[PDB]
Amino acid sequence: GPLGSMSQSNRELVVDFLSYKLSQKGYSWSQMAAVKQALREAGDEFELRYRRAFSDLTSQLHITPGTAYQSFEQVVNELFRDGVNWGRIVAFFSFGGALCVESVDKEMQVLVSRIAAWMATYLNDHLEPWIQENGGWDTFVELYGNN
Amino acid sequence: GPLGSMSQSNRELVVDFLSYKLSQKGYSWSQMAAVKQALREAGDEFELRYRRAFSDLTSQLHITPGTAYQSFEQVVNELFRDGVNWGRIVAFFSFGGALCVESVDKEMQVLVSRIAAWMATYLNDHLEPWIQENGGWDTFVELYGN
Amino acid sequence: XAXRXLXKXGDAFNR
Amino acid sequence: XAXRXLXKXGDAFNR
């Protein structure tokens, strides 16, 4: 997209750095910063725990630009067919990250922003409404934060 | 300020997670994500190595809302008076982080968004111009990322 | 498959 | 002091 100001992006870097240092001490820049950090911790632990059990998931999908959407939709639809919970939401994120890593391994990085949009839209329409009614983002931070 | 859309903040969470996961494999969502990551790591490392140095400093300061700015300016000016380099850039960041942490310990949370503004301005006007001339943000990434 | 893996092993991580 | 500190110990860290 078009170029923003130098100052907007210098701000964004400063805030990222300061958010990180604040969270290291039990503080937070914002509810967003607290969620980002808890989610990164969560995905690391989920992957440390359980990747050995589905380590060839993204590989068996045989991803290509033409089949990527259908493969993403199939996994994500199955992942939540019998319901939503916090652990499956974490898995939804780990899976999208693995699918992006897989896409770059296969020299298909045009898929990374695509996966990002598909995830954002799914979060928006199918996950946040469950999140709202099950304690909100604060409950996720309470359950997965500082871990 | 005014509230944005639920949709924009969902995108931002998603881009944040994918950024992290890509960088763990030596990939990057963008030059910004790569810089963010390398700087987080540079900072943890700088602070671990030179923690006694920080211990000395952020006592000797005695921050209060009416003096916080004067302290920031004095430290930052001497850090860069005879030159910028990548290590001094990291020290600047770590210094601002400690200043924010200390403000919150002493219940002067008001200073945190101010210190951010002063850091961002100084990065904009003094630090990024050097970087633009000295190899760019990519050089920083090749030096401190991986 | 690695569905009903990424299934029980999400469920196992639910707090 | 804790200046020509944060100087020497930036300059050590410089790659």
Side-chain angles (χ1 to χ4, degrees):
Chain A
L3 289 175
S5 191
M6 293 302 201
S7 51
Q8 299 181 92
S9 55
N10 283 320
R11 285 276 193 152
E12 174 179 328
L13 212 220
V14 167
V15 167
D16 176 279
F17 185 86
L18 302 177
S19 296
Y20 183 54
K21 282 350 173 123
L22 291 158
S23 62
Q24 281 176 315
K25 296 301 202 301
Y27 302 139
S28 44
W29 185 266
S30 59
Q31 172 185 79
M32 179 66 201
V35 169
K36 285 165 167 177
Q37 178 65 23
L39 185 56
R40 294 176 165 209
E41 279 159 2
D44 283 350
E45 179 72 0
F46 179 84
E47 286 154 21
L48 174 56
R49 273 138 86 151
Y50 311 110
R51 169 83 54 143
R52 66 199 173 187
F54 47 73
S55 74
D56 285 304
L57 175 49
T58 47
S59 222
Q60 306 155 299
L61 258 8
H62 296 298
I63 105 93
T64 63
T67 57
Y69 179 60
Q70 153 224 104
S71 289
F72 176 85
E73 185 194 42
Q74 307 185 56
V75 172
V76 170
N77 281 155
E78 300 192 357
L79 169 48
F80 305 103
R81 208 179 307 287
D82 48 316
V84 186
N85 62 46
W86 292 122
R88 287 185 187 195
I89 294 180
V90 174
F92 159 80
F93 283 100
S94 319
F95 169 69
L99 199 73
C100 287
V101 165
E102 173 76 4
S103 303
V104 180
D105 295 335
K106 300 191 86 187
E107 298 191 26
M108 289 168 311
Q109 35 201 323
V110 293
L111 298 186
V112 171
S113 57
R114 297 187 196 163
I115 298 158
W118 306 329
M119 292 177 69
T121 306
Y122 192 84
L123 216 203
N124 222 53
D125 293 324
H126 302 290
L127 256 15
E128 190 163 42
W130 184 92
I131 282 160
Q132 313 196 116
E133 305 212 287
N134 288 264
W137 286 114
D138 281 351
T139 293
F140 175 75
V141 169
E142 296 163 14
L143 301 177
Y144 293 84
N146 281 123
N147 253 80
Chain B
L3 275 160
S5 74
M6 296 289 265
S7 171
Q8 308 157 191
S9 54
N10 288 329
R11 313 150 182 158
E12 185 187 332
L13 219 211
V14 166
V15 176
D16 181 271
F17 188 86
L18 299 188
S19 284
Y20 183 53
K21 286 345 195 150
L22 286 169
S23 69
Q24 287 173 316
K25 293 285 191 256
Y27 300 143
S28 53
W29 167 268
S30 60
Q31 181 189 71
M32 174 68 89
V35 167
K36 289 174 164 171
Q37 214 75 62
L39 183 65
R40 286 177 171 210
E41 311 177 320
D44 287 342
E45 172 161 9
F46 186 92
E47 289 153 27
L48 172 61
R49 278 148 65 139
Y50 316 114
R51 259 316 154 141
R52 204 171 111 250
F54 281 93
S55 151
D56 300 353
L57 180 58
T58 331
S59 72
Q60 268 170 243
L61 246 39
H62 301 306
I63 64 167
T64 49
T67 50
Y69 181 63
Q70 172 191 347
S71 274
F72 179 90
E73 176 173 61
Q74 291 168 2
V75 168
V76 170
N77 285 155
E78 205 47 36
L79 170 53
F80 296 112
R81 184 187 46 79
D82 69 359
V84 179
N85 67 44
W86 298 117
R88 290 179 181 199
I89 287 173
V90 177
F92 163 81
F93 275 99
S94 289
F95 166 72
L99 206 49
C100 291
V101 170
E102 177 86 321
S103 300
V104 181
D105 292 349
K106 315 223 142 290
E107 297 193 279
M108 317 179 289
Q109 299 92 318
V110 291
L111 302 183
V112 170
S113 64
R114 303 188 193 169
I115 292 158
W118 313 327
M119 290 175 67
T121 302
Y122 193 83
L123 211 207
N124 193 251
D125 287 330
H126 303 286
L127 263 17
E128 175 171 52
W130 181 87
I131 294 172
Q132 289 168 339
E133 248 78 53
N134 281 277
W137 293 106
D138 279 347
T139 293
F140 173 72
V141 175
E142 299 186 343
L143 289 175
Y144 291 84
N146 83 77
Chain C
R4 290 328 288 179
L6 174 75
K8 61 154 161 202
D11 290 340
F13 204 60
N14 185 38
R15 292 175 188 174
Chain D
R4 23 166 143 341
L6 228 206
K8 92 151 300 208
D11 289 342
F13 207 66
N14 174 37
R15 295 180 195 170

